[PDB]
Amino acid sequence: DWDLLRASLMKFKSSSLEVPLVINGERIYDNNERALFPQTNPANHQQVLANVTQATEKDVMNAVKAAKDAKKDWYNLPFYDRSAIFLKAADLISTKYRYDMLAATMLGQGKNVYQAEIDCITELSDFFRYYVKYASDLYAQQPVESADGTWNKAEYRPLEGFVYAVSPFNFTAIAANLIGAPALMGNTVVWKPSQTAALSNYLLMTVLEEAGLPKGVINFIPGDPVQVTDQVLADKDFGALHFTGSTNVFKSLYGKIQSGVVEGKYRDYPRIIGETGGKNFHLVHPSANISHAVLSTIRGTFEFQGQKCSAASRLYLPESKSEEFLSDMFGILQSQSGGNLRGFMGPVIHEQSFDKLVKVIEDAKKDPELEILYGGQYDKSQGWFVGPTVIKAKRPDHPYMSTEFFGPILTVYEYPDTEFNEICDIIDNTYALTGAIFAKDRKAIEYADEKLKFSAGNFYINDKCTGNILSRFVSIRNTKENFYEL
């Protein structure tokens, strides 16, 4: 068990894998014409895990064409058989390829074994199995004779144009979700994986092919983000963006798409299905179990270096409980594989993130309205290591309470106990994916639950804030037959 994992880690650690494009079922390597991106280990950046072939404009056009050419045979493949491919992929990843997938995700994305397992084995398999179940329900349509005598059927067709999947580094499972949800519903996909998840994502591609995915149904085109995206969006048959990642990248994609829409580039109005996370909050009420709120906040903020769409990054503490909360938290942090380094829970994904977080820490040192209460340690000599960091803001509207850092950085504001209601109001005034209240008093919980209803899509009571899409990839078509002759 541990030996099989060790063996997988050693395989990937001992040489660099050549990661090709996969277009129309065919593996395309650099062949001395295409650029090569070195994917390195975030915990040990001297180690090159893979040399990733980079798609040219021509490659992208070919990927788009492959998707169009595969479309008809794909949506005419019965749902039972389309599903079997994805269930088979889930089983292959859970068994045959379990240790390879774990190792690729650990090494490439900088996760420990438990983080890797929850992501690239469990959650990944869950997406596929659950989508098959939901889809089976959606497709269970029987024709009906209406009261007026007409004979009616409804059918869910895929989108007419192709789907562009743009996936993030942070979860191997999310890449699976982004490509699998549209494909299952009879769509075909051009897929640009994150450069820094290429190893695990390529594995996922090869597993799908082994599971029987037909050529061209999904096309794997890593490359320069701007270059690949501009060429995908140039095609008149672009049907949908399926995206998970940062706000700023989404905004860029959005504006590029709308630009094409208004100037008539597209046959249809493209659908945009994006998730970006936000500045998620933990709100502590004076009645909270402090120990539980502390531990929940540590896990919510610092687990996987805060690199989750749902990660907590701002904390509101009542004044009468601040010292106890903070001293408890600092004590626990102070008392605390693909690679690791003492004083750090794990690495961040790349040098760009590392450099951004360094700026965040160094800027805080020079801001009189900020105070670093704990941490701020960083070291890039071996890997991209940034330590857990806690920064107190003097006012609740300081930029640090709203700027997303995508790292292990917590900004805390302390409010006077009697102004609990006002603090909820402030949160409601000023967008988050998730939020949590820690409290025992039900009237306060009810107040916040109601007041913050527009401030988070998922609200948690006494739990960390880290814890239907199929219908976005189809359109209904009704057929109605009349038997009466005028």
List the binding residues for NAD(+).
Answer: 255-260
Longest dimension (CA), the chain: 85
Give the one residue of 6, 157, 359, 365 binding a copy of itself; rule: CB under 8 A. Answer: 157
Residue carrying structure tokens 């690199």? 307
Window of 2-10, 56-64, 320-328, 454-462 that interacts with a copy of itself by CB under 8 A: 454-462
Beta partners for residue 282, in sequence order: 315, 436
**Is the Cβ of residue 149 or residue 416 nearer to a copy of itself in the bound state?**
149
388-417 residues near a copy of itself, rule: CB under 8 A = none
Give the one residue of 262, 342, 368, 381 binding a copy of itself; rule: CB under 8 A. Answer: 262
**Catalytic residue (one of 275, 303, 404, 414):** 275
- Our finding on whether 114 is near a copy of itself (CB under 8 A) is no
Contacts with a copy of itself by CB under 8 A: the residue count is 81
Q: Which of 316, 298, 326 is nearest to 408 (CA)?
A: 298
**3-class DSSP assignment, residue 252:** helix
- Our finding on whether 237 is near a copy of itself (CB under 8 A) is no
CA distance 323 to 110: 33
**275 is annotated as an active-site residue:** yes
- Our finding on whether 447 is near a copy of itself (CB under 8 A) is no
**Is the Cβ of residue 359 or residue 442 nearer to a copy of itself in the bound state?**
442
Residue carrying structure tokens 């085109």? 221
Q: How many CB atoms lie within 10 A of CB 238?
A: 23
Window of 3-11, 225-233, 408-416, 439-447 that interacts with a copy of itself by CB under 8 A: 439-447
Q: Write each residue from 303 to 342 as x if it is in contact with a copy of itself (CB under 8 A), else as -, in one continuous string.
A: ----------------------------------------
* Residue 78 CB, nearest approach to a copy of itself (Å): 7
Give the one residue of 234, 249, 458, 469 binding a copy of itself; rule: CB under 8 A. Answer: 458
**Catalytic residue (one of 120, 303, 309, 404):** 309
Window of 6-14, 50-58, 353-361, 474-482 that interacts with a copy of itself by CB under 8 A: 474-482
Beta partners for residue 317, in sequence order: 414
β pairing state of 36-41 and 44-53: antiparallel
Q: Which of 79, 177, 86, 88 is nearest to 127 (CA)?
A: 177
**57 is annotated as an active-site residue:** no
- The DSSP element (H or E) to which 232 belongs, if any, is helix 225-232
**Is the Cβ of residue 362 or residue 441 nearer to a copy of itself in the bound state?**
441
Q: Write each residue from 192 to 231 as x if it is in contact with a copy of itself (CB under 8 A), else as -, in one continuous string.
A: ------------------xxx-x-----------------
The HSE-up count of residue 342 (CA atoms within 13 Å, CB side) is: 1
The HSE-up count of residue 277 (CA atoms within 13 Å, CB side) is: 24
β pairing state of 151-158 and 144-145: antiparallel
Non-local CB neighbours of 105 within 8 Å, separated by 6+ positions: 111, 116, 119, 120, 172, 197, 200
- Mind telling me the catalytic residues? 275, 309
